[PDB]
């Protein structure tokens, strides 16, 4: 009962690859990428991942439909949209790329969700506000801050772990 969380890979193959290895060596049923995968060729790299993918689009994602199509070739279970609202291990998740805070806030204050993954490069966090777990793993590529990171959430224990790549 462990979920991988990543975002902002920005075509950084070596780090994308380390992330996948880390998610495989761990249980990890599903992996969430709120990301700016950025380029289509990155999706290929995800064939080596032994888990389904719940993705969301960032501002820099150009080939939107091709990204969707390719993620589904990897597995029909995989999904991707601007916003994703799903339930996992009996938990209500809201997932999106960290664009406007106004959507983050309604999401938290609406009370409709147990977890809000608001992925983006800055403002890395794992906090609880109004009983809603708020998580942002930060950039997987580590280009703007110099610190590459991903995260793993144990849905069962409601505990999170930031992993510096």
Please state, in angstroms and rounded to a whole number, the distance separating the CA atoms of residues 17 and 34.
17
Nearest to 15 by CA among 155, 153, 123, 121: 121
Rounded to the nearest 5°, which phi and psi values hold at 120?
-175, 170
The binding site for Mn(2+) comprises: 8, 10, 36, 59, 97, 120, 122
Tell me how far apart the alpha carbons of residues 57 and 37 are, in angstroms, rounded to a whole number.
Answer: 8
Task: Label the pairing between strands 115-119 and 91-97.
Answer: parallel
Known binding-site positions: 8, 10, 36, 59, 97, 120, 122
CA dihedral 81, 88, 86, 140 (to 10 degrees): -30
Binding residues for Ni(2+): 8, 10, 36, 59, 97, 120, 122
Which of 1, 2, 5 has its CA nearest to residue 126?
5
Alpha-carbon span 163 to 56, nearest angstrom:
21
The DSSP code sequence of the chain is -EEEEE---TT-HHHHHHHHHHHHHS--SEEEE-S---STHHHHHGGG-SSEEEEE--TT---HHHHHHHHHHH-TT-EEESEEEEEETTEEEEEEES--HHHHHHHHHHS--SEEEEE-SS--EEEEETTEEEEE---SS-TTTS--EEEEEETTTTEEEEEE-
CA separation for the pair 79, 134 (Å, rounded):
21
Q: Are 19 and 160 in contact (CB under 8 A)?
A: no
Cβ atoms 125, 136 nearer than 8 A: yes
Q: Which long-range contacts (CB under 8 A, 24 or more apart) does 160-165 make?
A: 160/126, 160/133, 160/135, 162/124, 162/126, 162/137, 162/138, 163/22, 165/15, 165/18, 165/19, 165/22, 165/140
Determined by: X-ray
Burial of 59 (0-12, 13-18, 19+ CB in 10 A): exposed
Which structural domains are found in the chain, ordered by start?
1-165 (3.60.21.10)
Structural contact between residues 30 and 115, judged by C-beta atoms closer than 8 angstroms = no
Phi, psi of 132 (to 5 degrees): -105, 125
Report whether 143 contacts 10 (CB < 8 A). yes
């Amino acid at each position: 009962m462990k979920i991988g969380i990543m975002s902002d890979t920005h075509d950084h193959l070596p780090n994308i690859r380390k992330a996948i290895e880390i998610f495989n060596d761990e249980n990890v049923e599903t992996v969430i990428h709120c990301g700016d995968f950025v380029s289509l060729f990155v999706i290929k790299e995800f064939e080596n991942l032994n888990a389904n993918i719940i993705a969301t689009y960032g501002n820099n994602d150009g080939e939107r439909c091709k990204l969707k199509e390719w993620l589904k070739d990897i597995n029909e279970e995989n999904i991707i949209d601007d916003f994703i609202s799903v339930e996992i291990d009996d938990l209500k998740f809201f997932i999106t790329h960290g664009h406007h805070q106004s959507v983050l806030e309604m999401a938290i204050k609406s009370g409709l969700y147990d977890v809000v993954i608001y992925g983006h490069t800055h403002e890395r966090v794992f906090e609880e506000v109004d009983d809603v777990l708020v998580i942002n793993p930060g950039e997987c590529c580590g280009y703007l801050t110099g610190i590459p990171t991903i995260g793993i959430l144990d849905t069962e224990k409601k505990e999170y772990r930031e992993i510096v790549l």
